[PDB]
DNA sequence: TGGAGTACAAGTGTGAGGAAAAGTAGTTGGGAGGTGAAAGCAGTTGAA
DNA sequence: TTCAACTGCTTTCGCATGCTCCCAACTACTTTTCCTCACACTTGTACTCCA
């Protein structure tokens, strides 16, 4: 195996500045993750973990939840985005799990 | 005197177990290494406060912005009174504003009166020289360097009735030779970029540079750090850069390049210790205590210790300690990247005998990092020391007495917006949850009074039947849609999808709902072996998942009871992805897409090999 | 020092310095034209005209340890085998091996045939090996004090 | 009142900066190699 | 004449042999192909000050 098929295949650099989501954009474009599979996330399994990390009283679980219901058009369906076009990662934070973190 | 020298260099790195045996048969320490032996030295702060107020580089032409040392004015050159400690520092907008007593610590005076002389140029260096013990006094003058000028001031005869510190002056001698000057020392002796001169100081503030000077100009040195000091009082200046040290006598005509540090080091800082002979030099990779020579005071390079931290912006402060049989010399290096310190304890004995102890470090305040650390002369084995710092991205001057005995602006200045129509409409959601939290505590309390009833049991009887119709429809909704080669809700019901309140009793329903199905096209993923990413440990039952969550929010909530029930139930409304088809569904598509590629793609699509 | 300052279940620290001067010690010439990165001469390599910092460390720390078991012949033979014919600091310690012999042997515990004219070698080895320390380059020794040490050894020789 | 310029935003277009195991580069510093007598005695020529 | 001469050949055993690398060890800079997204212009929709 040649000298650059061994270095790409090893863990040379870590994913940085949101690099991990941006390969999921090429993974949602080279095959469309929409209209084949389902891009719905279990966002309650997300927020269950984030409460006991910071150990606020669990009142903020629904207080976060009323925020997400108020902002999201079509309340449910914090879906994952697709990008099939080019290298232009959109500057919108279109990814589902990152939207929960800003909420 | 020991044995270790070379005549040009003299080394003792960290725990080399150095080269200075003599085999003294005196039956008490039969070796005289360059190392001491004693117990530890832990350092604790005594914190106080004194006063207050492109991006990937730093301009080395700045040296200091503050100085503070004991002074002896003309009235103290006359009377019995000797010693008042002052401070000379900068403040204001661009640092161009130029402006005491010791109760138990160092503190600013009671009369809160500084001497505000106005300066029309940014300040690059503030220092007072300090005098020698062969002239008997402590010098009353002060020399500073601006960006546009070079101004020399002088303190004269302060008061005690109001603690009034007043200044006389020398004039701003502007750049008649138009080159920026770098580091001054008095002990108008100046170091311009590459060249230098010896000046004359006037006593006449009622209205200069001699014809002896030189240069060290290195064409192969691309920085502009320069540095001069009087060395051993015989009109010998030491002119530095980040490449070499030149020894220049400006009274005779005799120049010498002494140190040459271009190969694997540089010169970072050179603090002139108030001692006449012993003076430290800080390089990178090594801390040098090169003193002067006994016979002929030219230069004698003495015992040194290596320094592992590497950076381009390292400086040093060094404070003596007088003891009866010896003299300590602590060595605080610091940088502009981090908050850490590094210290070493040398020792000077009577026959120019040097030793060493070891190294330690302390911690500091998390607002920025230091840029300049200044020690206190303190007017004169239970070691003590005192100093004061100044951090970057700050302008406060703390106080420390070390002895042997995080809010970011962008996370704060982004919120709290100041409009009038938008002043309470953000809180409309705050009024919305108070419309829903008062609601959704009464809707659950319908079910909380229901405990082991028949009135709540008939809901689950309808629940096992309302899911059972649309799911066998969904099982055959996947056989009609099987000729595809091209999905899970658990919200098929519409009654409430919230109307039962028990952790053990719904598990009796769903496991019986699991014993309902045995045919193909219906498959259920695990829950007692798949929930466990939250507790990060064993979850032997879904019921005892709630058990320690019941032991979790006891003190932090009103009544603490029903919310922990309903979120665990909401995971059953969220984690339960239970509509995977059976084995005809992957197998019909693990071979069909395997046919879309040829025989080259077959064997390169391979598992079950290890 | 983590083996030298442990001394509880130790490997004595001096076996590791023996590991250093057995595999890294090379007598190549310092070629000086190649641009050295990540290996630097003055504190980790051991070329000709530059005895290694870890090689002369294993000299002093195995003579201080050699005193503190009271084996001197085990190192006096061992220093004899390299002709480090450039540096002067290894000639002082090669004199200092015999200077510890002429201090330890010159006791005699009587209150006399071979012990008197064996030390007369060890005085003569310190005197000739200190002169070749002065014959080489810059490394000054207190050779006025050592002859005050050596004559005090002679006071029990007589 | 009916019609023009402030700028919230948004997708279009073009290369550039980063990574590493490999290789060739530049010196040395070793190593074994490989490119007549002791005495005859004769014949013949010796030479001014 | 008288003489050397130097060439020739023979036992005795015999002693008995006489252009400079090529490749290791160090090291270093360069080789080879890959990878993830910044800059800027432009375009839209809006509400301002327009007679």
Curated annotation (Swiss-Prot), chain A:
It is found in: Nucleus, Nucleolus. Although it shares weak sequence similarity with SUA7/TFIIB, displays a similar subdomain organization as SUA7/TFIIB, with a N-terminal zinc finger, a connecting region (composed of B-reader and B-linker regions), followed by 2 cyclin folds. This is RNA polymerase I-specific transcription initiation factor RRN7. Component of RNA polymerase I core factor complex (CF) that acts as a SUA7/TFIIB-like factor and plays a key role in multiple steps during transcription initiation such as pre-initiation complex (PIC) assembly and postpolymerase recruitment events in polymerase I (Pol I) transcription. Binds rDNA promoters and plays a role in Pol I recruitment. After binding of UAF (upstream activation factor) to an upstream element of the promoter, CF is recruited in a SPT15/TBP-dependent manner to form a pre-initiation complex. Component of the core factor (CF) complex, which consists of RRN6, RRN7 and RRN11. The CF heterotrimer may further dimerize to form a hexamer. RRN7 interacts with RRN6, RRN11, SPT15 and RRN9. Belongs to the RRN7/TAF1B family. Residues 5-103 are annotated as: C-terminal cyclin fold. The chain holds residues 207 to 309 of 514 of the full protein. It comes from the Eukaryota. Present with 398 molecules/cell in log phase SD medium.
UniProtKB/Swiss-Prot annotation, chain B:
It comes from the Eukaryota. GO terms for molecular function: RNA polymerase I general transcription initiation factor binding; RNA polymerase I transcription regulatory region sequence-specific DNA binding. This is RNA polymerase I-specific transcription initiation factor RRN6. It comes from Saccharomyces cerevisiae (strain ATCC 204508 / S288c). InterPro entries: RNA_pol_I-sp_TIF_RRN6-like, Rrn6, RRN6_beta-prop, RRN6_HB, Rrn6_K-rich. The keyword Nucleus applies. Keywords: Cytoplasm, Nucleus, Transcription, Transcription regulation. Its main location: cytoplasm. It is found in: Cytoplasm; Nucleus, Nucleolus.
From Swiss-Prot, chain C:
It is found in: Nucleus, Nucleolus. Acts as a component of the core factor (CF) complex which is essential for the initiation of rDNA transcription by RNA polymerase I. After binding of UAF (upstream activation factor) to an upstream element of the promoter, CF is recruited in a SPT15/TBP-dependent manner to form a preinitiation complex. Present with 476 molecules/cell in log phase SD medium. Component of the core factor (CF) complex, which consists of RRN6, RRN7 and RRN11. The CF heterotrimer may further dimerize to form a hexamer. RRN11 interacts with RRN6, RRN7 and SPT15. This is RNA polymerase I-specific transcription initiation factor RRN11. It comes from Saccharomyces cerevisiae (strain ATCC 204508 / S288c) (Baker's yeast). The chain holds residues 255 to 443 of 507 of the full protein.
């Amino acid at each position: 195996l040649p000298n650059y098929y061994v270095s790409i295949l090893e863990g040379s650099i870590s994913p940085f500045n949101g690099q991990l989501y941006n390969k999921i954009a090429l993974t949602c474009g080279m095959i469309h993750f929409k209209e084949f599979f389902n891009s719905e996330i279990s966002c309650q399994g997300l927020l269950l973990k984030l409460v006991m990390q910071c150990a606020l009283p669990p009142e903020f679980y629904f207080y976060t939840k009323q925020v997400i219901e108020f902002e999201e058009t079509d309340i449910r369906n914090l879906t994952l985005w697709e990008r099939t076009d080019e290298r232009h990662t959109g500057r919108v934070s279109n990814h589902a799990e990152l939207r929960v973190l800003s909420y | 005197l020991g044995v270790g020298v070379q005549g040009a260099s003299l080394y003792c790195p960290q725990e080399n177990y150095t080269t200075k045996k003599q085999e003294k048969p005196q039956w008490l320490r039969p070796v005289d290494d360059t190392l001491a032996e004693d117990a530890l030295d832990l350092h604790i702060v005594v914190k106080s406060l004194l006063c207050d107020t492109d991006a990937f580089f730093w301009d080395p032409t700045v040296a200091n912005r503050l100085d503070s040392q004991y002074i002896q004015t003309a009235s103290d050159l006359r009377n019995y009174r000797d010693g008042t400690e002052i401070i000379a520092y900068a403040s204001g907008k661009t640092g161009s504003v130029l402006n005491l007593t010791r109760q138990n610590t160092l503190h600013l005076n009671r009369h809160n009166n500084v001497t505000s002389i106005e300066l029309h140029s940014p300040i690059k260096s503030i220092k007072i020289p300090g005098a020698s013990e062969s002239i008997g006094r402590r010098s009353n003058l002060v020399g500073i360097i601006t960006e546009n000028s070079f101004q020399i001031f002088r303190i004269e005869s302060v008061h005690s009735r109001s603690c009034d510190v007043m200044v006389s002056s020398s004039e701003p001698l502007y750049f008649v030779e138009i080159d920026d000057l770098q580091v001054v020392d008095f002990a108008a002796i100046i170091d311009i970029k590459g060249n230098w001169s010896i000046g004359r100081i006037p006593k006449n503030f009622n209205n200069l540079i001699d014809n002896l000077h030189g240069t060290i100009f290195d064409p192969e040195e691309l920085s502009s750090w320069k540095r001069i000091e009087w060395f051993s009082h015989f009109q010998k200046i030491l002119v530095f850069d980040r490449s070499k040290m030149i020894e220049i006598d400006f009274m005779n005509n005799w120049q010498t390049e002494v140190v040459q540090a271009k190969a694997w080091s540089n010169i970072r800082d050179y603090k002139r210790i108030d001692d006449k002979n012993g003076i430290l030099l800080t390089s990178r990779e090594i801390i040098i205590v090169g003193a002067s020579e006994s016979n002929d005071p030219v230069r004698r390079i003495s015992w040194k210790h290596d320094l592992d931290p590497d950076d381009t912006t390292l400086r040093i402060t060094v404070q003596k300690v007088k003891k009866p049989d010896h003299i300590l010399l602590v060595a605080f290096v610091y940088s502009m990247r981090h908050k850490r310190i590094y210290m070493h304890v040398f020792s000077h004995r009577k026959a120019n005998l040097f030793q060493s102890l070891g190294c330690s470090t302390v911690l500091e305040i998390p607002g920025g990092t230091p840029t300049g650390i200044e020690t206190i002369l303190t007017l004169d084995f239970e070691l003590v020391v005192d100093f004061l710092v100044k951090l970057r991205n700050s302008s406060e001057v703390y106080y420390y007495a070390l002895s042997n005995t995080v809010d970011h602006p962008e996370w704060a200045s982004l919120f709290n917006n100041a409009d009038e129509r938008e002043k309470e409409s953000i809180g409309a959601l705050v009024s919305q949850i108070k419309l829903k939290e008062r609601e959704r505590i009464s809707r659950v309390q319908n079910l909380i009074e229901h405990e082991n009833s028949h009135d709540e049991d008939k809901y689950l009887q309808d629940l096992g039947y309302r899911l059972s119709i649309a799911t066998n429809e969904l099982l055959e909704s996947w056989q009609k849609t099987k000729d595809e080669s091209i999905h899970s809700k658990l919200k098929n019901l519409l009654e409430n999808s919230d109307s039962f309140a028990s952790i053990p009793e719904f598990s009796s329903l769903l496991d019986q709902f699991f014993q309902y199905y045995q045919d193909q096209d219906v498959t259920f993923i695990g829950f007692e072996k798949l929930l466990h990413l939250f507790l990060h440990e064993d979850v032997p039952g879904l019921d005892i998942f709630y058990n320690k969550l019941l032991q979790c929010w006891v003190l932090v909530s009103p009544q603490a009871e029903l919310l922990t029930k309903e979120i665990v139930k909401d995971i059953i409304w969220s984690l339960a992805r239970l509509e995977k088809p059976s084995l005809f569904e992957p197998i019909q598509n693990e071979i069909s897409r395997s046919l879309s590629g040829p025989y080259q793609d077959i064997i390169s699509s391979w598992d079950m090999d290890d | 020092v983590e083996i030298l300052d442990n001394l509880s279940n130790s490997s004595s620290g001096l076996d590791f310095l023996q590991w250093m001067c057995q595999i890294y010690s090379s007598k190549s010439r310092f070629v000086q034209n190649i641009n050295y990165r990540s290996i630097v001469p003055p504190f980790q390599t051991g070329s000709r005209t530059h005895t290694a910092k870890f090689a002369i460390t294993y000299l002093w720390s195995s003579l201080i340890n050699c005193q503190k078991s009271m084996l001197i012949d085990k190192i006096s033979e061992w220093v004899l085998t390299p002709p480090f014919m450039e540096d002067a600091e290894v000639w002082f310690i090669y004199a200092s091996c015999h200077l510890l012999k002429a201090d330890t042997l010159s006791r005699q515990f009587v209150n006399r045939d071979i012990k008197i004219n064996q030390v007369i070698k060890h005085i003569h080895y310190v005197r000739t090996f200190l002169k070749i320390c002065l014959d080489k380059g810059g490394f000054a020794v207190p050779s006025r004090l050592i002859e005050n040490q050596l004559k005090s050894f002679e006071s029990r020789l007589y």
